[PDB]
Structure formats: C-alpha cells, structure tokens
Write a protein that binds this DNA or RNA. Sequence first.
DNA 1: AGCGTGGGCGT
DNA 2: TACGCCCACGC
Length: 86
Amino acid sequence: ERPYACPVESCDRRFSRSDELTRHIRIHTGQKPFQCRICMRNFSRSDHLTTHIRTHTGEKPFACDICGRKFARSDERKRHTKIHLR
DNA sequence: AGCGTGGGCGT
DNA sequence: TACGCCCACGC
Ligand SMILES: [Zn+2]
Ligand SMILES: [Zn+2]
Ligand SMILES: [Zn+2]
C-alpha cells in the first residue's frame, strides 16, 4: 500500500493518504501558510502555529497529575510525568 | 527545559 | 481537502 509517493527527485517518502503527501510536499516547496500575528513567523502547519502562540501568551493547558506543574503541550507534560517514577 | 516540526491518524 | 490531536525526534 501507500500509493501516494513524493515525486521530488531525491525523495523516497510514500504515504497512505493523499493529504499526507500534500502536507509533506510543503517541505520541498517551503510553503509556510500559517503566520503568527504576534511575531510574524511563518509555519508549515496550523497545529504547530497554535502551540507556538502559547510561547507568547504563556497559556499552559496541561497539568501534571502528580504535582500540578503546567505545560504548553501535551507531550511536554508526558515527558515530565515520568520523572515521578522511583 | 522549551519548543520547532514531520508522520500517522480520526474526524 | 481541512483541522487538530498524539506521537516522536531533534536541538
Ligand atoms: Zn518528498
Ligand atoms: Zn509568534
Ligand atoms: Zn509532575
């Protein structure tokens, strides 16, 4: 499977979904359609723009279950929680 | 630590 | 196709 192959020369990436290839090809086109209004930096992806903006606002939605420490991203919290192991 | 950013995916 | 999650890697 993975019928959607990248057609850029030296690239061998292949994908299961059409939209995956369309997203991937932005690495080659350099297209960064999503701009931060605060610092004007451009981003390849809407979801990464959203987490980037928390760097300006200080928004930290994700609290550790053990100690309550807050993080901008779920994966930051995930990396953190395991420090509480023995 | 703080966070850029691609892949896989559900919707 | 978009939107926005988790996941993972990288610095
Ligand atoms: Zn490619
Ligand atoms: Zn910004
Ligand atoms: Zn904690």
